[PDB]
Amino acid sequence: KFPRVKNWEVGSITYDTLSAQAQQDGPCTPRRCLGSLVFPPEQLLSQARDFINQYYSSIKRSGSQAHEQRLQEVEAEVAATGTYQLRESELVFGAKQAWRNAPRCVGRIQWGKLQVFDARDCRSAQEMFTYICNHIKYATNRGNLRSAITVFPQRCPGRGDFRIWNSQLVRYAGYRQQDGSVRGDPANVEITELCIQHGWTPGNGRFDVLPLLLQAPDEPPELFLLPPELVLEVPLEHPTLEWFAALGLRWYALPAVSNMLLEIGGLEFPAAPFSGWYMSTEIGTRNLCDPHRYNILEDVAVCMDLDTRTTSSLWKDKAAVEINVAVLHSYQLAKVTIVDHHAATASFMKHLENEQKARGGCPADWAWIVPPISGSLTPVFHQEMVNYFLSPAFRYQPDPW
Amino acid sequence: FPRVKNWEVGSITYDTLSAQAQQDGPCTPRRCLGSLVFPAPEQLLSQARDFINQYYSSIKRSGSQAHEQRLQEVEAEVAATGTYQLRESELVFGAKQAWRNAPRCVGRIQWGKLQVFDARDCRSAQEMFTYICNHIKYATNRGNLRSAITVFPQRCPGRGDFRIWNSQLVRYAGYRQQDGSVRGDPANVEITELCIQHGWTPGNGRFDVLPLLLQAPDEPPELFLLPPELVLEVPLEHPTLEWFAALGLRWYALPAVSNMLLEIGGLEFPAAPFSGWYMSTEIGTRNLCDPHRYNILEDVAVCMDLDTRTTSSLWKDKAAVEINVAVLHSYQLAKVTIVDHHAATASFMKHLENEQKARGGCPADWAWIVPPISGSLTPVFHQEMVNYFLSPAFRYQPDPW
Numbered sequence A: 001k002f003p004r005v006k007n008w009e010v011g012s013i014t015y016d017t018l019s020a021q022a023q024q025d026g027p028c029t030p031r032r033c034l035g036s037l038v039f040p041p042e043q044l045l046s047q048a049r050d051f052i053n054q055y056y057s058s059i060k061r062s063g064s065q066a067h068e069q070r071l072q073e074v075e076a077e078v079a080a081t082g083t084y085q086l087r088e089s090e091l092v093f094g095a096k097q098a099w100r101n102a103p104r105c106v107g108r109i110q111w112g113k114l115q116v117f118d119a120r121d122c123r124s125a126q127e128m129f130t131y132i133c134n135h136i137k138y139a140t141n142r143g144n145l146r147s148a149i150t151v152f153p154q155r156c157p158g159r160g161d162f163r164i165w166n167s168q169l170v171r172y173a174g175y176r177q178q179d180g181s182v183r184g185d186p187a188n189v190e191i192t193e194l195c196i197q198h199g200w201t202p203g204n205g206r207f208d209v210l211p212l213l214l215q216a217p218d219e220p221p222e223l224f225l226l227p228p229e230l231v232l233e234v235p236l237e238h239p240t241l242e243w244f245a246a247l248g249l250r251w252y253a254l255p256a257v258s259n260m261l262l263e264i265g266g267l268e269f270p271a272a273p274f275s276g277w278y279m280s281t282e283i284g285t286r287n288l289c290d291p292h293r294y295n296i297l298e299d300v301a302v303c304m305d306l307d308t309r310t311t312s313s314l315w316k317d318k319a320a321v322e323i324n325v326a327v328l329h330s331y332q333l334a335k336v337t338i339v340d341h342h343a344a345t346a347s348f349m350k351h352l353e354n355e356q357k358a359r360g361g362c363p364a365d366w367a368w369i370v371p372p373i374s375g376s377l378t379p380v381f382h383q384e385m386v387n388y389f390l391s392p393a394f395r396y397q398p399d400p401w
Numbered sequence B: 001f002p003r004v005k006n007w008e009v010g011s012i013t014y015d016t017l018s019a020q021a022q023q024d025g026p027c028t029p030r031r032c033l034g035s036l037v038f039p040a041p042e043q044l045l046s047q048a049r050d051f052i053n054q055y056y057s058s059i060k061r062s063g064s065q066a067h068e069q070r071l072q073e074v075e076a077e078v079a080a081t082g083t084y085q086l087r088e089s090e091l092v093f094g095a096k097q098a099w100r101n102a103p104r105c106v107g108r109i110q111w112g113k114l115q116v117f118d119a120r121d122c123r124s125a126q127e128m129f130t131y132i133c134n135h136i137k138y139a140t141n142r143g144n145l146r147s148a149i150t151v152f153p154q155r156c157p158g159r160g161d162f163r164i165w166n167s168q169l170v171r172y173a174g175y176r177q178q179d180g181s182v183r184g185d186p187a188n189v190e191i192t193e194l195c196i197q198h199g200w201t202p203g204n205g206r207f208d209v210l211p212l213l214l215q216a217p218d219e220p221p222e223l224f225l226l227p228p229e230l231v232l233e234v235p236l237e238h239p240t241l242e243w244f245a246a247l248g249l250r251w252y253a254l255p256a257v258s259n260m261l262l263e264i265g266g267l268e269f270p271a272a273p274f275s276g277w278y279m280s281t282e283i284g285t286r287n288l289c290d291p292h293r294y295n296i297l298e299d300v301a302v303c304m305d306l307d308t309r310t311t312s313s314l315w316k317d318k319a320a321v322e323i324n325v326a327v328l329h330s331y332q333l334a335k336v337t338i339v340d341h342h343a344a345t346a347s348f349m350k351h352l353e354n355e356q357k358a359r360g361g362c363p364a365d366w367a368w369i370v371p372p373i374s375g376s377l378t379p380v381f382h383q384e385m386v387n388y389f390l391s392p393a394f395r396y397q398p399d400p401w
């Protein structure tokens, strides 16, 4: 009933007792495991009781005056309005907990250092844009990156949602050709097609920053050109491969997910963009070397004069490491915050032991915590993990179309 | 039926075979335990009945006279003895199916090409030794490795099991040290001690081949030295790092797993060693670079004059790539079969396509199929998989001591 979990590098055994609390059931059964799949009126009071109970136990305040009192006020708000409002401190507490509960996030050692911008008093896309622009400039901070989330108004029935239509606040364009293939990032062909559709003049480039499609309740979206001085980018160069600069590769400083739904206490915020800083394999391995992404691996190998005629030269492996070195070197030279996959996973091990002591476990998704290069060279590879869903949470949600 | 996506190509399939998963696994809708390493005549009848059905399907005779006659035969044999005997052809098919069904094997494109030695008439630990030497001789084949399995007598009532105490036929001793360290392979410290206390005179190298501890029913295990000329090994050298040879590193040619149980139609064979050939990462990454194994990573990196002072130099990634290059070059120089992780995962994608057409799916453990370096550079990273248990099957079993 309490999973026994082992670390094979050291031999140590822990029990995940926190797992016994898991709520929104996952996709696995005793008959088949689906852990490797990416995407697997008044029950509101149940989720509310539990979250407010969480909040007060966290501040050493269970069964106290402010606790029972706040419980009645949510009872009364829902009774009269069919919903409720979070106290500002609860909204701050819920955002940090959801980050803390994200099983696929390797950077949760940072979960208590998060800046929350309360945008629950927002109306119209033009207003979101200034909220978003303030987030970006605050989080970017001339390259000394700072974790932030901007929380736009919660969801109510009979009224449409606030939504950011881009998956991230900074994405590069993907344009097709006289032959189907894509100039730019193929991960964003859809939203590039939607932006151009809504009256944006495309570029001719591999690294064109897309505009933003912001949508206010029960209204169509609006394009917004991001201020170019607010979008910090890093040209990629290699410390010793002089020709790497000539490949013309770049990436942006701020990873800011703008398509996930934040759920606290039974309330749902479909517009809540959050940002941290990059782990270097995200850029150098997934974004630039994935076959369906920029797919540069062979081009770098030719420049390195590697033998691409046989897979057993490990030319792929060699080129991939140099691309990752170039990312780290370039961000450091730009003085933009970035973390390598060894340093991050080592910190995640530290986080796991923190969370064992504090909460008796930590939901973690082994396939997402283990980096996409050098997996067994990092300590998380040899750590057995337990994956489950706790609330507050970040959840995926359908594209708003 | 679980919908399964490949993210490199965008294609989608449904794993209908999963609906037939017999014995149950460790996951629930509450929590996923996929990353854990170790997750009555009437019941024997119904397993037996299912396997026979499988066998007669495969030979295009489902529903025949011989089919029903064999069912009847199996029932009368269970009624009168509490067990039954496999026919030889049924045993060959059961052993191939067990390999086919093994979710953590990336080499299963080869599943139909397997040599089955029927040792079920084996009488003692001395005969068992002779059968094993013959297996090693045939499978090694002077470096042109051939996949094989030798099946010793089945678990049956009134008698104990045949057991091979060694986890593989070829293993290097691990000697706990003066200062509490280990000389040789730390994975084999337990079995090394057992050999010594059963009369083996230890060596004190890092690559001392262990004797075999072979157990006949209701007999203490018996010690057997492998004839040196039967154990093919490969000294490790690097194609361009000439000091690499001075590490004195070696590995053996034949990976022959000997401590697993083969189950076929409810019959259990606690001794049925099987062998194929190596994928280079097993040796170059896990066996040599795991911190709890040979753990050579930092010594190579220093020798390469990498900057081992900061993780952002990626010295670990670079040293590990050259260790894998050395393993591949060395085996190819010695003319000993080996497959690199790029070719292996590519042939596994073809296996998944073959199996999707043949059975409607394929049991696959993503965390074990994706190689421990350069994960997302291989195509199995971008393929979603369903993990489940089919019979016939190789199972883990407790060590007999």
Ligand code: HEM
Pocket (backbone or CB within 6 Å): A095, A099, A102, A104, A105, A106, A107, A110, A114, A147, A148, A149, A274, A275, A276, A277, A278, A279, A282, A339, A344, A368, A394
């Ligand atoms: C501060 C440094 C941070 C680092 C280094 C980091 C790293 C990562 C990485 C590598 C992933 C895997 C994503 C992928 O490969 O697609 C991830 C996922 C995730 N991160 Fe973090 N992150 C950071 C900050 C944050 C913050 C501030 C939040 C929320 C406030 C957050 C929430 C999440 C969530 C919810 C996921 C799961 C997304 C999904 O399921 O697709 N992260 N993170």
Ligand code: HEM
Pocket (backbone or CB within 6 Å): B095, B099, B102, B104, B105, B106, B107, B108, B110, B114, B147, B148, B149, B274, B275, B276, B277, B278, B279, B282, B339, B344, B368, B394
């Ligand atoms: C011929 C080439 C073969 C290759 C390249 C290959 C490759 C692999 C690899 C890389 C693993 C993962 C091992 C680990 O990381 O611990 C594995 C596991 C496994 N293989 Fe294969 N293999 C081959 C032949 C065979 C044969 C002939 C059999 C049985 C007749 C077999 C049955 C299994 C089983 C049962 C496992 C899982 C072992 C466990 O769960 O601990 N393999 N294989």
Ligand SMILES: CNCc1cc(F)c(F)c(-c2cc(C)cc(N)n2)c1
Pocket (backbone or CB within 6 Å): A255, A256, A257, A274, A275, A276, A277, A278, A279, A282, A283, A286, A287
């Ligand atoms: C190739 N990764 C793309 C990707 C997908 C996601 F779903 C993420 F959540 C993040 C992400 C988010 C944050 C806040 C920090 C960070 N380092 N990454 C990145």
Ligand SMILES: CNCc1cc(F)c(F)c(-c2cc(C)cc(N)n2)c1
Pocket (backbone or CB within 6 Å): B107, B255, B256, B257, B274, B275, B276, B277, B278, B279, B282, B283, B286, B287
């Ligand atoms: C670091 N791997 C150790 C290991 C553990 C296992 F459980 C295996 F089954 C194999 C294995 C077995 C066969 C027949 C071929 C092959 N290439 N590997 C290897």
Ligand SMILES: C[C@H](O)[C@H](O)[C@H]1CNc2nc(N)[nH]c(=O)c2N1
Pocket (backbone or CB within 6 Å): A036, A037, A038, A367, A368, A369, B007, B381, B382, B383, B384, B385
């Ligand atoms: C098919 C597989 O589940 C899918 O590609 C997952 C695996 N693990 C991952 N891990 C991270 N961090 N990011 C990803 O996109 C993926 N992709």
Ligand SMILES: C[C@H](O)[C@H](O)[C@H]1CNc2nc(N)[nH]c(=O)c2N1
Pocket (backbone or CB within 6 Å): A008, A381, A382, A383, A384, A385, B035, B036, B037, B367, B368, B369
């Ligand atoms: C704890 C973790 O599950 C463990 O180290 C697993 C991960 N994936 C693996 N994959 C393979 N092929 N072999 C292994 O031994 C492991 N070990």
Ligand SMILES: [Cl-]
Pocket (backbone or CB within 6 Å): A255, A282, A287
């Ligand atoms: Cl990204």
Ligand SMILES: [Cl-]
Pocket (backbone or CB within 6 Å): B255, B282, B287
């Ligand atoms: Cl091995």
Ligand SMILES: [Gd+3]
Pocket (backbone or CB within 6 Å): none
């Ligand atoms: Gd030149």
Ligand SMILES: [Gd+3]
Pocket (backbone or CB within 6 Å): B240, B241, B242
């Ligand atoms: Gd030289």
Ligand SMILES: [Gd+3]
Pocket (backbone or CB within 6 Å): none
């Ligand atoms: Gd020395």
Ligand SMILES: [Zn+2]
Pocket (backbone or CB within 6 Å): A028, A032, A033, A034, A035, B027, B031, B032, B033, B034
């Ligand atoms: Zn699972």
